[PDB]
Design an enzyme around this catalytic site. Structure first.
Site, PDB file in Angstrom:
ATOM      1  N   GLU A   1       0.870  -1.144   0.231  1.00 50.23           N
ATOM      2  CA  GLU A   1       0.033   0.030   0.085  1.00 50.23           C
ATOM      3  C   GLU A   1       0.917   1.132  -0.055  1.00 50.23           C
ATOM      4  OE1 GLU A   1      -3.367  -2.239   2.800  1.00 50.23           O
ATOM      5  OE2 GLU A   1      -3.566  -0.418   1.954  1.00 50.23           O
TER       6      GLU A   1
ATOM      7  N   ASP B   1     -15.328  38.853 -32.803  1.00 44.10           N
ATOM      8  CA  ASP B   1     -16.403  38.385 -32.123  1.00 44.10           C
ATOM      9  C   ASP B   1     -16.535  39.168 -31.077  1.00 44.10           C
ATOM     10  OD1 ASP B   1     -18.421  36.964 -30.993  1.00 44.10           O
ATOM     11  OD2 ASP B   1     -17.429  35.091 -30.368  1.00 44.10           O
TER      12      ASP B   1
ATOM     13  N   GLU C   1     -18.456  39.927 -36.329  1.00 49.55           N
ATOM     14  CA  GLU C   1     -19.820  39.034 -36.117  1.00 49.55           C
ATOM     15  C   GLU C   1     -20.731  40.275 -35.382  1.00 49.55           C
ATOM     16  OE1 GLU C   1     -19.710  35.433 -34.009  1.00 49.55           O
ATOM     17  OE2 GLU C   1     -21.284  36.093 -32.916  1.00 49.55           O
TER      18      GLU C   1
END
Ligand SMILES: [Zn+2]
Ligand SMILES: [Zn+2]
EC number: 3.1.-.-
Lengths: 105, 646, 689, 44, 48, 48, 116
Positions: free
Chosen positions: B306, B458, B530
């Site tokens: 582990e 944009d 745009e």
């Protein structure tokens, strides 16, 4: 005993189907040998004297032929488009593989 | 004991017309032409039918035919009676004298591997593992589903162990062993790269809650000890209160299906298996974390159980083991999805390759859990044992009510929602990395560029908002690909009196820089603003760009004739063309066809983040978007459509 | 230990014959490129070899016919393909050679053999022809046979037997043309971008660092349906083998060497500039090094060409016109890329990779970013050590050029150094992957690709299932007492009685895993076995493989994994009286497969409840696709209730077969469509014993 | 039983709630979670 | 044996004697090349 | 030559090849490798 | 790997020497114990192998003779009085053992000691 086909035929002025019907398709044909003749011409071994050298040539001419057939008006074959796309991608890949190592310096 | 019938065959001296300068010797068959070695369709059939003899009968499978591996070596009785009366030629005497020598000598190196105890150790290990897992791992003696199954990671771990132990104990046969372990794992057709991958060391495993994590390693050790001779498997763990259970579960079976006389055991420390001829292999426990493990002789495994929370002050001995020349630190772990990120180990995936493997049932995006759904084991599927009290609901609504992280767990809330809703990534990480890293130098390869620049703006006409950014992209053709020359993510100053001119000044400044960096390159620049947000405001931006640029390349604007109108306005309306534009971009981007200039320009994205890195963060949202939209649309325009004009 | 079985020496004889036939196909592929005047010299040899191949069939014809109908194997599949491609191309080339010596032109001989005037004979129609709807696909490429065999594997519970073994004879007709050569793959039918079925298991078994397989599978070359053959070719190969030739017993072997030495002493590189070029031009560059290397390669090629011409002239007297010379005009007008892909009959396709690597890697590259390529393992080891150690403890807007140009120059001056420092300090793990991926994508395109062992293996694995199913359908018709119940004069009573007596009990929710497993075991196909290996895997994994390869929509995996997770009489009994396996009112592929999943679930749960209620019977629910044949002609079908997936007579109950396994006179079997009537007939037999 | 089905299919749609729907389909997991909560609150 | 002699470098003593000396049962192979030496060694040691 | 050039050098054997290389290359004067207290052939070659 | 055979052969061959073997922290000396006594008892008879844990090891000879390897690793006593040491095989003097230099400097005073 158990003779081959080359000692059997002995005559080579005919067509293939006649010899088939006369020597390998007759019911009485004993057919007791398997021996594939050597078909490579000495005029080709003396220039490509290596199976690797006889395979590189056999692949280069294959690539050439596959380029020539794909370069009445059908032209709508997916293989032509595949070869075109492969060539374009290869060019674009080598393009960004020399410049990338130019930059790293 | 002698194996199969494929390593004892007679000569069968058929014939050959090829000169000895060419002919090669394939083992098990006679001497054939050299071209039979560059053809895998033959050199992979004539070689598999040989190693299918070394493989014992307990490893062919479960229903493989009574006497042979029918899926490889089977000839119908009619075909056997037909090829029986087939007779080749007979080799010439002067040619059969050396041919038989070559044949029976190229085969000796196989009837010699079938004898060496170094290989018999591996054969015994694998055969005992198979025969002892047939009945699932229990207290058997080793002398409707009845056969146990290894899950995926329970097989990857076994492969990582077995291939390394074979490459270590068998070095002089690194070729006859790879293509035998391939047949024994039923993993042929596997290129040597993806098998040499198992030869590497220190391959970390991240496993969910239980998945038979511990239940599998104890039989692995019990069989890797009592089979090989001369290895000392180190087995560290967490606080040593958990290691004594491993002691007991190893020694119970190791003494169960074997003799106790060979079981050497000291409490809290090493365990040793002895062999009837002065040999001993141990499993010395480095769990003490103090001594007895620093000096390494034949460890080679270091089964760290582990590594989730590494043991305190125990990393020094591990890092010293990493210095050992023949150690493969397996580094098992258990992230039970209680944390879902053992970031002490999970950070390894950042800069490494083929090192760690995660057994996960939910992806990075927690919506496509159904990606790994059919793989989740059926044993761990228990529910309240009642579908509904009284309800007629489809599985969709049931699983919505019965989600509970899809595994009865309490996984992280937020981020990726519970209803997947067909949510996925679009641009591949690999194309993204190349987009970031490979940037053609446009200032010095100008001959590769098309003579037209395309710019898309944009606009957002608000301030003091995160979605108030104006996106600008200027792109062009580079060879047959698309390259970005400039990017802007521009934020209006609040309550300016001139927002369109502020935006125009931003785009003009960008263009100018691009023009100056590539003088004389461009005959045209085509500009699209745009107009979805505001047509008037878009027109105003175009007008300011128009005027400012008036201080060579011709400047054109995309024009739009709005519905019901006869007027051509210098704005672009984004509607029906969005889906085609995005679709084309995604395809081009993913194939390496869109890139950024090495001398890409950006005034607005320069101090806080790299502009290309910033764009890529927006692009990775495909399934604030002003920049992404401008880039995708500028490229679409450079691609193909209706003509824009003066 | 002396007696070796006949199917062991027969396999060695077949391997020898396969080697001879592969050699013959190599010689054929060679003669399709030699000068016709030289080929005509080997006309009797070629005629004799074609006669030998003809006579080699008509003996293996009945054997391979009885094999194709009973458990094909990857041996007798490649053997069939090669014995067909030889019998095809040998006669074709012989016809093209006997057409010669009548017209006497070479440029029209290399259009017949090499196929420059054909209508692209690499197309086929499959027409899968399932239940409900006969979907049809076309096999254009090599991966298009993998993606069709995996589709026919996944849609096997939905496809009739003789409607599949008649769409596999249509796949073999294509494979004979495409993969029939087994030695070289034409660049047309090879797309290394599309991953195969065995390079999906690679990603599943090798190490994944997150990065679910759906995203790792898109950066793969798949390297398995085509290989690379690693051809190497020395420099002076012509001078080496010149003093050692086949004939040439005269001193001409010395004058030929003299002419070779005399002639030795006696790529469009001007196109690289139009490629993208970065950095400084003055001084050495990567482009300059690449141009020098390519010039050296072209010089070696030209020297080899002139030496070969001189040797052929001095030895035989006539300069031969092979394919590379008769069409040599088309090797001149060739672009840099179109002549970089093809080319180099003197050099090797590995020499071009060498010329590229020697150009991209000099002593001036860097200290870092160079060791990670030469050792990609030490990099990850050092990264692991590092991880372990870290985890242990405004205004004045200008209009003119003089200002905007200066600010843009400053910005680019910063940013050209920014990423330049990114590529060197950070981004080593990304560059070490990008370069090792572009290099692989290059070597896969330049190296001589031959063929892969995938297609003739998956073809056999798929065809064996349908062969075994059609064999079990016809082997039981000839048995002892048959109780065929497809005719129902008095079966409604015994069907309804048993259906009522079984629908009266709950599914015993403690048995749902043992039902989900036997559902994922029936639904899965025969190709992806992964559940009968020695190191077996859960049937859900063997099904995940078979269902993820053929791209299945994610919205159908929950309908598969969570199908028996919920199990009253609703969703329990779906079959009508006699329409157990009937798909009359369903069309499509997915809604026709849901109806098959429903019948399989009904059968499994009915068998479980019958074993629970009437404890007398055992009802081992089996499948005929298993039980591969032993040494010879024996199949030993054990007792049970077989599904058989055949909408004609699906359920076949073998209640008492034999004490040894075969099906003979003591092998009473019950044919039926419906499941509950099958269970009633099983009860009427097993109970009074 | 078809009338009970017609009533339940009317009172239980996908828009009801995330909670107050799982306690009906599993009145045991609710009490188990309540026991866990009680034990955790009484622990500290 | 390598013998370092450019006249006849490689000398393969495949079966010399049961006592060591070189006499009548001491078949030896002279050769320059290495691979032909290995082939001649194979043609002797294999059929035993 | 073809049948031998088809296999890799088995990089697990490179020390047993480097030793037999330093043992052939070395001369007869500086022995230092057949003594009772022998030394690695690389040392017997470093001396010579 | 070399010093343990050196000691095993320098003990069972000569008669009348007591090789002192110091080291670092005594957790590393017990491995030397085991690797000396395993072979010293391996290729010889166990009867002549006299062994006490954590302290001296002694080889006995068939005629009233005994030579030992008394371990000065304790660094406290049993090593200050020197009779026939003559070797003092100090293993790791890189970082000298704490407060163990006094016994070493006292050994340097012995007339026939060669501190290796
Ligand atoms: Zn086509
Ligand atoms: Zn693949």
């Amino acid at each position: 005993t158990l003779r081959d086909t080359i000692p059997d035929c002995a005559l080579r002025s005919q067509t293939l189907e006649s010899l088939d019907a006369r020597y390998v398709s007759r019911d009485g044909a004993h057919d007791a040998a398997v021996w594939f003749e050597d078909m490579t011409p000495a005029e080709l071994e003396v220039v490509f004297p290596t199976t690797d050298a006889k395979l590189n040539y056999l692949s280069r001419t294959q690539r050439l032929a596959s380029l020539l057939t794909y370069a009445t008006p059908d032209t709508a074959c997916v293989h032509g488009e595949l070869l075109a796309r492969k060539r374009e991608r290869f060019a674009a890949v080598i393009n960004r593989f020399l410049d990338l190592h130019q930059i790293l310096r | 004991t002698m194996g199969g019938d494929a390593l004892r065959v007679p000569f069968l001296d058929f014939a050959t017309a090829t000169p000895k300068r060419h002919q090669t010797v394939v083992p098990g068959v006679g001497t054939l032409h050299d071209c039979c070695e560059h053809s895998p369709l033959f050199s992979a059939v004539a070689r598999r039918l040989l190693f299918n003899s070394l493989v014992p009968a307990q490893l062919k499978g479960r229903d493989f035919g009574g006497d042979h591996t029918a899926k490889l070596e089977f000839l119908a009785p009619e075909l056997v009676r037909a090829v029986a009366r087939l007779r080749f030629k007979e080799c010439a005497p002067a040619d059969v004298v050396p041919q038989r020598n070559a044949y029976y000598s190229v085969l000796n190196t196989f009837q010699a591997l079938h004898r060496s105890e170094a290989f018999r150790q591996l054969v015994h290990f694998v055969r005992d593992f198979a025969q002892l897992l047939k009945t699932s791992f229990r207290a058997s003696s080793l002398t409707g589903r009845t056969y146990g199954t290894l899950e995926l990671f329970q097989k990857m771990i076994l492969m990582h162990a077995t291939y390394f132990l074979a490459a270590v104990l068998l070095g002089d046969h690194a070729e006859q062993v790879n293509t035998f372990l391939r047949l024994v794992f039923e993993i042929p057709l596997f290129s040597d790269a993806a098998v040499r991958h198992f030869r590497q060391r220190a391959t970390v495993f991240l496993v969910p809650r239980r998945h038979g994590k511990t239940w599998f390693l104890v039989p692995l050790i019990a069989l890797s000890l009592a089979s090989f001779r001369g290895i000392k498997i180190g087995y560290t763990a967490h606080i040593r209160k958990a290691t004594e259970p491993v002691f007991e579960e190893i020694d119970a079976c190791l003494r169960g299906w074997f003799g106790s006389a060979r079981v050497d055991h000291v409490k809290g420390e090493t365990i040793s298996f002895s062999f009837p001829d002065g040999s001993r292999s141990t499993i010395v426990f480095a769990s003490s974390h103090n001594t007895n493990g620093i000096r390494g002789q034949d460890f080679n495994l270091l089964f760290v159980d582990e590594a989730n929370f590494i043991r305190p002050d125990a990393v020094q001995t591990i890092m010293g083991f990493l210095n050992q020349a023949n150690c493969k630190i397996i580094f098992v772990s258990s992230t039970n999805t209680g944390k879902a990120s053992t970031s002490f180990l999970y950070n390894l995936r950042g800069a490494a390759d083929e090192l760690l493997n995660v057994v996960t049932y939910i992806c990075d995006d927690h919506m496509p859990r159904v990606v790994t759904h059919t793989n989740a084991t059926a044993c761990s599927c228990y529910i309240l044992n009642k579908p509904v009290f009284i309800t007629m609901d489809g599985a969709v609504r049931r699983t919505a009510d019965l989600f509970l992280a899809d595994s009865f767990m309490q996984e992280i809330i937020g981020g990726q929602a519970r209803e997947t809703g067909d949510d996925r990534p679009v641009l591949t990480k690999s194309a993204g990395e190349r987009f970031l890293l490979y940037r053609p130098s446009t200032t010095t390869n100008s001959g590769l560029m098309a003579p037209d620049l395309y710019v898309y703006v944009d606009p957002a006409f608000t301030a003091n908002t995160r979605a108030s950014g104006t996106g600008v992209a200027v792109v062009g053709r580079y060879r047959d690909d698309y390259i970005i020359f400039a990017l802007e993510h521009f934020f209006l100053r609040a309550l300016t009196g001139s927002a369109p001119a502020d935006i125009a000044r931003c785009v003009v400044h960008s263009l100018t820089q691009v023009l100056a960096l590539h003088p004389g390159a461009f005959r045209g620049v085509r500009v699209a603003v745009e107009g979805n947000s505001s047509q008037d405001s878009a027109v105003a931006i175009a007008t300011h760009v128009h005027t400012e640029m008036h201080r060579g390349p011709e400047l054109l604007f995309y024009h739009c004739e709005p519905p019901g109108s006869a007027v051509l306005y210098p704005f672009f309306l984004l509607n029906k063309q969005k889906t085609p534009a995005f679709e084309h971009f995604i395809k081009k981007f993913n194939s390496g066809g869109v890139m950024a200039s090495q001398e890409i320009v950006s005034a607005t994205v320069r101090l806080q983040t790299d502009p290309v890195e910033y764009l890529l963060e927006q692009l990775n949202n495909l399934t604030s978007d002003d920049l992404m939209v401008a880039v995708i649309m500028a490229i679409y325009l450079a691609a193909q459509a209706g003509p824009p004009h003066t | 230990a002396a007696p070796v079985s006949e199917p062991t020496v027969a396999r060695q004889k077949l391997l020898a014959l396969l080697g001879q036939v592969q050699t013959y196909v190599f010689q054929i592929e060679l003669l399709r490129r030699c000068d016709p005047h030289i080929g005509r010299g080997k006309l009797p040899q070629l005629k004799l070899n074609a006669l030998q191949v003809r006579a080699l069939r008509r003996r293996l014809r009945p054997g391979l016919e009885a094999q194709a109908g009973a458990f094909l194997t990857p041996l007798s599949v490649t053997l069939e393909l090669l014995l067909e491609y030889a019998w095809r191309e040998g006669e074709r080339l012989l016809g093209s050679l006997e057409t010669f010596a009548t017209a006497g032109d070479v440029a029209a001989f290399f259009t017949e053999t090499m196929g420059l005037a054909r209508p692209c004979p690499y197309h086929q129609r499959v027409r899968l022809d399932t239940y409900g709807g006969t979907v049809h696909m076309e096999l254009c490429f090599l991966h298009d046979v993998e993606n069709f065999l995996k589709q026919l594997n996944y849609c096997h519970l939905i496809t009739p037997s003789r409607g599949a073994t008649a769409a596999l004879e249509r796949v073999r007709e294509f494979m004979v043309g495409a993969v029939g050569s087994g030695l070289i793959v034409p660049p047309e039918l090879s797309d290394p971008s599309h991953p195969c079925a065995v390079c999906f298991e690679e990603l599943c078994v090798t190490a994944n660092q997150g990065a679910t397989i759906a995203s790792r599978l898109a950066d793969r070359i798949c390297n398995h349906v085509t290989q690379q053959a690693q051809v190497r070719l020395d420099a002076n190969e012509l001078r080496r083998y010149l003093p050692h030739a086949a004939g040439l017993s005269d001193a001409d072997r010395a004058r030929a060497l003299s002419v070779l030495d005399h002639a030795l002493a006696r790529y469009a590189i001007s196109e690289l500039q139009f490629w993208l070029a970065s950095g400084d031009r003055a001084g050495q560059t990567t482009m300059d090094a690449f141009a020098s290397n390519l010039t050296a390669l072209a010089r070696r090629e030209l020297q080899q060409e002139t030496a070969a011409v001189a040797v052929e002239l001095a030895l035989f007297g006539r300069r031969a016109e092979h394919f590379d010379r008769a069409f040599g005009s088309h090797l001149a007008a060739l672009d840099m890329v179109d002549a970089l892909i093809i080319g180099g009959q003197a050099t090797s396709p590995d020499d071009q990779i060498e010329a590229l690597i020697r150009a991209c890697y000099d002593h001036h590259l860097t200290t870092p970013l160079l060791r990670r390529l030469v050792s990609p393992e030490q990099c990850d080891e050092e990264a692991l050590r590092r991880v372990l150690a870290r985890m242990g403890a405004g205004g004045q807007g200008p209009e003119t050029w003089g200002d905007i140009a200066t600010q843009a120059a400053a910005d680019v001056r910063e940013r050209r150094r920014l990423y330049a420092d990114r590529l060197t300090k950070r981004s080593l793990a990304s560059l070490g992957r990008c370069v090792r991926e572009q290099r692989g994508e290059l070597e896969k395109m330049l190296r001589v690709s031959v063929h892969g062992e995938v297609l003739p293996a998956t073809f056999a694995a798929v065809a064996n299932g349908f062969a075994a199913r059609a064999r079990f359908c016809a082997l039981t018709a000839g048995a002892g007492t048959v109780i065929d119940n497809r005719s129902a004069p008095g079966v409604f009573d015994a069907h309804r009685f048993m259906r009522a007596s079984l629908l009266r009990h709950q599914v015993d929710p403690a048995l749902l895993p043992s039902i989900t497993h036997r559902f994922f075991e029936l639904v899965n196909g025969p190709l992806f076995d992964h559940s009968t290996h020695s190191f077996a895997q859960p049937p859900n994994t063997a099904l995940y493989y078979s269902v993820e390869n053929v791209g299945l929509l994610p919205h159908l995996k929950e309908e598969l994994a969570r199908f028996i997770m919920g199990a009253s009489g609703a969703d329990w009994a779906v079959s009508e009286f006699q329409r157990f396996y009937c798909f009359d009112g369903i069309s499509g592929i997915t809604p026709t497969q849901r109806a098959a999943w429903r019948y399989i679930r009904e059968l499994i749960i009915a068998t479980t409840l019958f074993a629970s209620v009437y404890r007398c019977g055992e009802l081992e629910l089996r499948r005929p696709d298993c039980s591969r044949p032993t040494s010879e002609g024996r199949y030993r079908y054990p007792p049970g209730v077989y599904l058989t997936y055949d909408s004609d007579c699906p359920l076949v109950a073998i209640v008492e077969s034999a004490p040894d396994g075969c099906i003979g006179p003591r092998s009473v079997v019950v044919y039926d469509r419906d499941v509950f009537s099958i269970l009633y007939s099983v009860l009427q037999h097993l109970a009074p014993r």
